[PDB]
Each structure stands twice: as C-alpha cells, then as structure tokens.
Symmetry: D2
Subunit: 392 residues, 4 copies
C-alpha cells in the first residue's frame, strides 16, 4: 500500500503590516478564521477534524497552547487534539508535512495544518525570579530575540543575508532589482484579484466599528528602482542589505485541510494537490539562506523528479540576497518563481510563512493549470524545508 | 514488513526544584546533555542523527529554536535538523511519537526525541508596542500564563483537578494517601539506586565552582500524613487539592534514541523496548485530568492489547485527583502503577514530563522483567496522550 | 528698610497636550529654554545667576536633580546652585516665594524660580529589589500615583472635586458652563495674541526636522456646551465631574527672574511686579480644591489688602467644581478672574502650573495696567498657595 | 532685629543597611517617627507645627508628596503645610536652612525640617507611553539614575571621587586608613552609647512580630586594614576608590525643630543651638566631592568666624577621597572632625544625610560642651552646602 495524502482545501489571512491591521489581534484568532475557512471550503464539518497542527515561533503571553485556542474558537470540538510547533521560518510548511504523516501512519483521518504569527503582539520579557537588588535590566523583545536573532553568532538574520551576498558576489543593484520586481509582480497580482481565492477576510472586532481586512497591506504600490537605491543598509554599515530588499515584520495565518485521496473522493472534494514528497536539511547558520538548496534538491529526489519537470515554484523571499542565490544555484526558470511576487512585498509572518506561500502556490497552480510545483523556505539557525505537489 | 520502531537508548537529567539546582540553567543546556547521553549509551555517533525533536512549552527569550541550540551544543552537526513542539504536558511523550513517525514514513533513519523545560528561567512579559498611554499594567508570569492557566475559563490546572474531585467523589484523605504513597515509593526507589540508570548527571557550571546534579531534588524524604493533612487548599478556599497532593514546578530534560528494529540489530544495540502503538484524545478542558483514560484505551486497542495484559504502567501524577480517577476507571492493578513513584514526588517539568516517565518505564521494564508496558499523561486544555511499549 | 523683591522678567513655554508637542521632551530642556528667556528679557547674563529653583513633581528617570540640568544647559555657571522642590500643584508658585526668601534673607542677589513638568515623559515603575518569587505584579504609572492620587484616601483628585461639587451644591450645568467659558476666553486670548508676550517658543529637535512650538496646544477651538454636556462622569458614575470640566495632563515650564527692587533700579529694569506677600495653608485632603480660600485670604491679610482691592486674579482651574467654589466663597468679581482663560483650556503641567499662571497674571497686568494682582492654586493632599503682586 | 533661629530639638532614626532593617519601609514612615520625636523632645505639640519640610531624592512610587504623608501620620494638623525638596546629597541640611528662612521672613513660627530616604524602596522604571515599537529597552534603577549618576558625564559619583583622588594625589593606602578610621571611631561611639541621644527607635511592624531598630546597622565591627586593602576598585579597573572606602546605599530619616530664639525662651526650651549662618556654592560636577570647601568657607565668612574658631565639625564622608581633599584644603584639626565616625561607617541615606550629620553634630556639641560647630556635605552635580551652629 502507498497512502496518498491530499491538500483538500486551503486559506490564509491577509498579511498585515507590523503594528498595522492586526496590531492587536492574537494569532489564534487569525488561526481560527483560517481553520473554519478550510472546513467550509472542503465541505467538512469541524466535528470531523481529528487534530490541528500550527507552526508558531512567538507564542509568549498568549496562554496555553494557542493551537488548541484556535481550534476551539473555530468550532473544532473538545474530543479533538491540537498542538503548535517551531521550525522557525519553515514552521508553517513543516506542520503540513507533520499532518501528512499522522494520516500516513494510520493515526488520523482528517488534519488541519499550517501556521500563525502575530509579530505585532509579541511581548518584551525579562527573567525576574531571582530579583534585582541593583541595576538596569533589559526588557527583551521576544520578536527580535526568539525570531530574528541567530543564537550561535549573536547577530540578526539580515547579517546572514550579508554573508550569502558576499559568498555569491550579489551586488546591491541585483538585490534591489529583485526587490522591485517582487513589489511590481505582487502589486500586479493584487490588482488582478489573483490573491482573492486564497484570502479569507478577517474581521477585526472593535469598540468603534468592525473592519474587514481582505488585502495584503505590506505591498508597496508603484515600487521604483530609485526608491530602492535611495535606502541605507540596515545591518552592515557598508553593506548591501536594506529594508527595501529584505522582507518585513508581519502578522497572519494560513492553512490546509488534509485527508487521504480516497476520502476526498468519497465526499466529492477536488483537492488543491497531492503531497508527493517533502524534506528538511541543515546548513551552516552563518549562511542559513542557502537552506532551500539542499532542501529543494532532496524533496525532488524523493519525488523522483528532475528540476526541469516543475511548472511552478514558491521560494520564500527572506532577503533579496538569499532569494537571488537559491535561484542561481538550482537554475529553475525565474519566470515560474514567485509569479505573484514574494515576501519582500507580501510580508513575512514567521511561523505562518510556509503555509502562506503554500496557499499562494496551490491557488496559482489551480488558476494556470500547472501540474507540478514546489514550496521552499530558508530557516534561521541553518535549515531549509521543501514540498513537492502534484495536481490531480 | 511493518514499521517496527524501537527505542535504542534513553536518558534524562535529574529533575530540579523550582529556582533550585537548574535555577539559572537554560533548558537547551539540559537538552544538550541528554542528546549526548542517548548517543553514548547506544554507541551511536552524533553525526548519524538526522533530526532532534524536543517538546518545550516555555521558550520565551531563550532565543531562536532552543531545540536547535540543544542539538548543536551536544555535537549533532549542522547538517541535521531540530524543532520544538508543544502539546503542553504530553509534549515530551508526543515528541517520541513524532520521531517514530519520521522513521515509519522513511524520511529519517535516526531520531533523538523527548522534552525539555526550564520553568525557573521562564520570564515575565508584557505587550508594549502600542505603549501604555496611562494607568497601571501587569507584567505577566509566562510560566503561569502559558504553562498553567487554562486559556478557556481563565483558571489554574489545580481547579481542573478540583473538578475531577467533585465529579469522582474523592476525599481530602484519599488524595493525601496517594501523595504520601508516591513520595514513599520514590524515596524508597531513590535510595535503592533504581533511578541511577536513567539519570545522566548534569554539570551546573558556576563561577565559584561547578556542581554535579545527579539526583532529583523535588523528592522529599520521610513523608508523613500530618504534613500532607495540615496544608490549606491552594485553588479553592474550602477545597481538596493542595501543594502536597498536586505536582510541582520543575526543570529537567529527557530523550529517547529511535531507529528501526532492523537498524538496532545491525549495530548490536539491545533495545529498551519496541514502540508498538500510541494515541492522543481530547476531553472537556474543565476536567483535563481524564485525558489518560481515553488515550490509553485508544493506544491499547491499537496494539491489540487488553488492560489486563499490561505488566507495568506509568500514569503521570499531575494531581492526586486526576491520578486516582484514571486508576479507578481503567481498573488496572495499582500495585504496578508508578512503581518507583510519580510526579507529585519526582516533579513536573511540563515539556520534559512525557519523556521523563518514558525513561522510568523503560528502565524498570528492563530490570523487573516486564514484557509489556504503557506510559500515559493528562494534558492542559483537554487532551490525553499514551504510548504502548513491548520488550525484547 | 524691609526687603522688597521684584519679578524683573518672566517667561513660559507653550503648554503641550499629553503625549503631544513635547511628548518626548525632558522637563529640564523646557526649563532651560525658559531660564534663557527670563535672562534675555531682563537683560541679565547667565553668569550673574546665583540659584535656580524649579518646582517639579514627576522627575523619575530624568537623572540627578533636573533643576541643575536645566541651569547648566542654559549656561548658568557651575558656581551657581540649583534645586528642585515639590508642593504638588502649588510647586511652581511656591518656588517663586522660596526664591524671594533667598534674597530677603541676604543669601542671594539673583534667582530664577518656577517649575517644570513633563507628564508625558513620566515613567511606569515597580519595586523589584526583594525579587518577585512567582505570579504577576503591577507596573505603576508614576504620573497617576505620585501626581494625581490622594495618598490618604487612595482616590483621584477628581474625586476630591466631586466632594467639593456635593458640598457647594454645584450642578453639572454650572460646571460645564464654566468649562466652556474657560475654553472660549482662552481661544479668544490666543487668537488676539495675548499669550505671545508670555510665551517663549520652544524648538523640538528632530531627526527629520525641527518644530517650533509657540502655541498652547490643549485649548479647544469652538468648544460647544453640547460637547461638555455629552460627556460621561469620569470618577463617580452618577457624578458631575468629567474630562471636559477638569483640566488635563500636560507638559511645560515657566519661570520668573527675581532680584531686589533697588537692584532692578541700578540696572534700569522696568519690573513686571513687586512680590507684596504670599501664603500657604492646609485644608482637608478630601476637599483640597478649597485650598485657595484660606491661602488667598491669608495672603491678602499679609499685604494689607481687601479682596475688593484686586484688579486682576489668576485662580487655577484644576476642576470647574473647585474653581466655582473658590470664586463663590471669595466673592471677587468673576470678570477679573482668569480673564484669558484657565487650566481647563490651557492645561495643567503640575509642577509648572503655578509659574504658568503667574506668567499669565503678570503679562495681563502689564497689558491692562492693573495695579494689584493675585495668583492662587489648590494643592493635592489639601493645601493652598497664594501670591500678591503689585505693579511698579 | 536680625532674626535668630534656634534648633529647639532634633532626632534621627538609626541608619539601615541596603535592603536590611528598613528594606520595605516607605521613607515617610521613618519621617513620621522623627517628626514625633522632635515634638516630644522639645515639648511641642503637633498642633503647633506650621510646616514640615523634608529633603528626599528618591520619592518615586511612594505617592503624592511624602513630606505631607509623614506630617499627617505624625498628627500634624491638615491646616499646616508640607513639601519636599531635592538638592541631592545636600537636601537634608538645605531643608533646615530653608526652614530657618520661613521663620526669618515671618511666614512661620514653628517648622519641622530635615530629610528622609529609602534607597531600598526606590523602584525600577521605564517610559512606556509612546510604546517600544521594536528592540530591547532598559528598566532603569531610579536609585542609580536619579540618585547616583552624574547627569552630565554619565558616570557614577565614584568616578568623581576618582577625579578628586587623581587631582589631590591621594593614595589607596591613605583612603583605606581613613575608611578604617571612620569604622573604628563609629564602632567606639556606638559601643559607648554616644548615638543613643540622637537616635529615636523605629518600630518595623511585622506580620509575625514587630522589630524595634535603634542601632545603626551599617557600621562594621572590627574592621581591619586588610579588609579594605583586599577590595578591587569599584569604578576604575586601575583606580583607588572601592566599596570599602566609599559610603553605602542606605535608609533613614532625620529632623530638627526650629523656632525663633525668643520663642524657645518663652517656652522655657534649652535649644541644641542657634543657626548662625549657612551657605551653598557650586563646583565642577567632575569634582563634586570638593563642594564642602567653598561652601564652608562661605558659611564661616558669613558667621564672622575663622576656621580655627570651630570646636566641632561634621564633614560628610561620601568617599574617603573627597573627605580627605576637603580636610587637606580647609586644614581644620582632623581630631575635631567626625569624632564619632562618618558615613563610610554609618551609611548615606541621600536625602536624609545632611540632617543625619546635623544630628550627630548637635548631640556631640551638647555632650562635650563645644560652642562652635559646622556641618557640610558634597553634592552630586557639583555643589556644596554648610551650616554654622553656635551653642546656647
């Protein structure tokens, strides 16, 4: 026997700007909106879900197991189970793979999997148990410390982007021209409603009126080459990596309902793809941006695919330095990568990002009629992750 | 063939008291030591490890992916992978299930899985990005907030254990008799040397001298009934759960080394046991302590076992109310349950506990000649987790 | 020969709104600009200053003795001295009386006195030296706790205002009419340029552009009765005191340069006024708004003046309720009182407020040729302070 | 008529060690006990007090105007007034001069003046209103920032002491001997009972029992030269200033009751002394410890006294470096200086200090029948204060 698991349906919230639309929205509320979206999208009841798996890197102050909080809110019953996980920036795609294994091993019928992040709602913290007899103590930003800081080399993820830039000799112009392309592609898809299918509106409840967010607010309209070239380097003071050519700090969530291919056929569901293979591999944390290269190669090797059989790719844009590098090495046609733009434009809600690009990949595959696709992301601390999808 | 996954080796640190031995020791330092110890007792080099999965509930401020930090510090190379997960209190036993599924689906050969927790190091926090225009606020204790406060009703786990008491008509004398029986069992076994084999010593690097922690310090010697019956209830001013018949707040780590049964035989490794089956199930959050009941029935049914078949049990004592309710329903001989003691005496490092009680079961099964064996736990928010084990 | 002290020159900054124009300006920067202004307006050099005395209620986190920081920044020599003082709302006026006394006793020739306050920059705090063993604790708003809360009764100053409303039988209509009138009179004075003489502009230094602040930003233009009528009681849910008939939370500095009458004559300075008398008296904390009553009476008795001898009055408007009470009891003609509006409109930068209203008195006295003035304020904790000024 | 003000009576608490006897005692509680004491000692009823004046550098979080808190606790009537002031280390003496001035200008008859401080209770703070959009921020120790750091050069008072050691070429051995001598003189004086007359005991109310504190707890008994010599410099890795030859962080209060000489005679009071003169002068902040030189010289000139006229002197020991420079420059017989030890032994409760050493001077003057005395302190930010006292 050979299991065969499918992504029956999918949905992501809009990607919100740092301290923007979802500045005060807990992640699990966003998780709840995507959970109910994929349940109604597949025509599966919440009472049929066995388990819910959500990546999330910054859960501090949100209470017990936010994965359970989002399941219970979304109308999943208490007889189910739920948990979160953290492979950092790869978390939201990894969870989908972990959900695929629950079914493959005979321990679940129907999983909901993805990620959720509120980088806005991430707190400052300090270890205050001992007590402070004298002297300033630091209140630590958990978003910077737990999401953006290499634990081994002490510097920001964007410094790793400098390392990869200098390795591959990627000029400031090349990085900027990739950054403006991503903003133009993304603004172009948004106008044309190519993001409508995947986005489920989130309602931000308010004292003085409810608001419906259904649009990626981080996309810069009319992004220009000169606007990119005007900027100062954020990390290295004589470097190449600017705020324009790296992705942002963002809020959002994204998911996929998974079931066996036969169960989908029982119920008349038309899946957004079969999960044919997946893989995660580690590299040096100094150049974590190279993660997607070994990861995307192993995934393809597991599918029995060559790189030149693909039709579509989502390769996550943490930095125009590392995105450009991954693309150079693997050699896939750049006109099939980030067709609707990438993270530099859309945003980078860490734990949600992997389900985010997966959502974007599956819907464009349905839209253009691509059969073979791949989603991959670089990962802080030096990993990569990847997934090969085939359209039914 | 059948995916027949074994536990090649196992190791834990001793469990520390809150702000005690491991007071200022990062969880990942504690998890580093167990990853080396599992690799040593098996005879398996760190380079051969594909991935490290560690359950951990309270990572705030410890930096990017402490599972990865634990693995790198232990000498597992950059090429391997690592990630955290959180199903609260079952996390450590569910990571062993997850790592098993890696091997069963053929995505990995060798996994080190378990849990780690530093509850002493968990910080206080607040969301301060919007600022606080006027008026007092709370700096929140993330240990309480994210580790012990049920997200649904707003209260402590010691009130969910009170709901199990009023429902199952347990007395203030019935619980006081179970807590002293688990402190006497654990003091007995400790002075016997039955904990020796599972514990790997941890070195607490001081400045005015090192200290070697090689014994659980939450175990209290000479537990009387007067001290247990003289306390005031902590979670209800006229109630039955106290500090003495509830579990503690603790630090600790624990892990198993996993591979296929065929691979153990090639390497000349006599495995502690074979993982026959596992399961998790949800229950009403209000009465979370009854997770072990349906979870152990699911696990047992999957193995094709009766409750009678079992020769040794590890039912985690989060409380004396949840524990007695699980022992009475399932009706298994309590003379074989928590045979060297439970978490009232031993302690309760949230994320580690699942991996902690797996150690105790695996080393006692080896020693007393018990063929079959089940470990089980209750989980906050309303779930249960269980894993059946068979001897070679 | 009895010591005669004169106010040679005075100045204030504009009064900023809470987290408004001066949101991130330390009180001492504001004080430094007013110190430089009184010196320039009197023709006295910084080098001649013996002492600076600045009332200030909320200096936490600003560093050692902000009054010295203000004097040094203003170029007052290191050989001079400087100190801060605190009689709450009375501070800025009390400091002038204290300055007067340094010259009366022969200990100094030349004093700059007043006060300064940045309610905006006041921090949140907690006592964390003992160490917090477990659970949540409070970050205390120092502005509320140290500035606005009665230390004996534990309620806000606005609750003392409610006590005064009840005792003097002051309707919500009478309080709201008074409030609207203070806004309309301030708006009119502002429009006609009656605050220009007293205000020295303040340059808020910026990364991306300097902003000159020379207008009182808290004054509401076109304030309507209905806008006051619509508000909810802020302190007693069936009370009369609201946000609209109370003063606000504000930032500013204000000062006066003093010397003897004979000294002003040698220098050829035409002084703003002679300090004829001052007084300070306690009342019940519960009705602290009544402070001005005994304080003004005692100040007039010391001058040898009848209430009817006054040509102009500044009675500070902490709350409409108390301003009304004061005016009723004293019986002075209301048309000579706060002729250019009061603190309901202008603001109440606590430690500066007494020097703020003295500036307004002095510059209107000059403009209209009023010979006899009085400035008075109520004081949290139950006190009053009053000063009689006569024109030369 | 040249007003002649006497110190009718005086008192102080013992000086408490940092987080020691008065660890959770608010400063106004200490002040209340000394207010009661000066009244009882002088035979004056609380109802007769016109004003209370208390220096206090670190009032954050204690609530509105702690001077008023103290006065009201001590039964001083609501109709009196009270205020705090801040001239840093000079405060507690300056407040006495300012009290004298109330009486001298005919504004009051009876004043209670001194200082109070609880460095233990001083909180950590931060400005949080604008929010912290991203990145770490410090919780600031208000004791260090507002008490002990130079606001201009950003360094500790200890560095100014190093500046004075370098400038006066004061060896480590000379400073250490001075420090040892302060300890041994204070020990001898404590043992002989010489602090008993000045100290009023203070009841620390407990929950498991009340503790009466009537001994200065910071004084080290049996202090050795070797114990000073073994310390490492605390501020300059190659300096001379140490924990041992500097004063400490402390809690306490101290006060004097003032009235006219003619008033004491009416009441039949034998006063502790007549205030003959006072002075305050500025110096370079970099060498603030030199303050006492120009202040003492100025106070003596004012009194009409030569340095040689003095029979007793209290010169506050902030640091052995500056105490030594002061004594060298003035050249007064070091045998009449700090005859019962100084603040290196006794402690330095900032705002209370100047009234602390006034108390010790007055009670030793009475003891030995000394006719002419002077007290002086150096002040943070570069100032000096001094008062001349003559026995009746």
């Amino acid at each position: 026997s050979t299991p065969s698991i499918v992504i029956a349906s999918a949905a992501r919230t809009a990607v919100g700007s740092f301290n923007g639309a979802f500045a005060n929205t807990p992640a699990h509320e966003l998780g709840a909106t995507v959970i109910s979206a994929v349940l109604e999208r597949a025509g599966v009841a919440a009472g049929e879900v066995n388990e819910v798996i959500l990546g999330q890197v910054l859960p501090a102050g949100e209470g017990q197991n936010p994965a359970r909080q989002a399941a219970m809110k979304a109308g999943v019953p208490q007889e189910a189970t739920a948990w979160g996980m953290n492979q950092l920036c790869g978390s939201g795609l990894r969870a989908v793979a972990l959900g695929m294994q629950q079914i493959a091993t005979g321990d679940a019928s129907i999983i909901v999997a993805g990620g959720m992040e509120s980088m806005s709602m991430a707190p400052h913290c300090a270890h205050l148990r001992g007590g402070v007899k004298m002297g300033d103590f630091k209140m630590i930003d958990t978003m910077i410390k737990d999401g953006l800081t290499d634990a081994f080399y002490g510097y920001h993820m964007g410094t790793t982007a400098e390392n990869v830039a200098k390795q591959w000799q990627l000029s400031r112009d090349e990085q900027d021209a990739f950054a403006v392309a991503s903003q133009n592609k993304a603004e172009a898809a948004q106008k044309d409603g190519r993001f409508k299918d995947e986005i489920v509106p989130f309602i931000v409840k308010g004292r003085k009126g409810d608001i419906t967010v259904d649009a990626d607010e981080y996309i810069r309209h009319g992004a220009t080459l000169d606007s990119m070239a005007k900027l100062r380097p954020a990390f290295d003071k004589e470097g190449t990596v600017t705020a324009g050519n790296a992705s942002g700090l963002n809020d959002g969530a994204a998911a996929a309902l998974l079931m066996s291919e036969a169960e989908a056929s029982r119920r008349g569901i038309q899946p957004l793809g079969r999960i044919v293979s997946w893989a995660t591999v580690g590299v040096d944390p100094k150049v974590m941006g190279t993660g997607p290269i070994p990861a995307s190669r192993k995934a393809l090797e597991r599918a029995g695919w060559k790189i030149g059989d693909l039709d579509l790719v989502e390769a996550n844009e943490a930095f125009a330095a590392q995105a450009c590098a991954v693309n150079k090495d693997l050699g896939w046609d750049p006109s099939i990568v980030n067709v609707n733009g990438g993270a530099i434009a859309i945003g980078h809600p860490i734990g949600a990002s992997g389900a985010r690009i997966l959502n974007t990949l599956l819907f464009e595959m349905k839209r253009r009629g691509a059969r073979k696709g791949l989603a991959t992301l670089c990962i802080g601390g030096g990993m990569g992750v990847a997934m090969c999808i085939e359209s039914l």
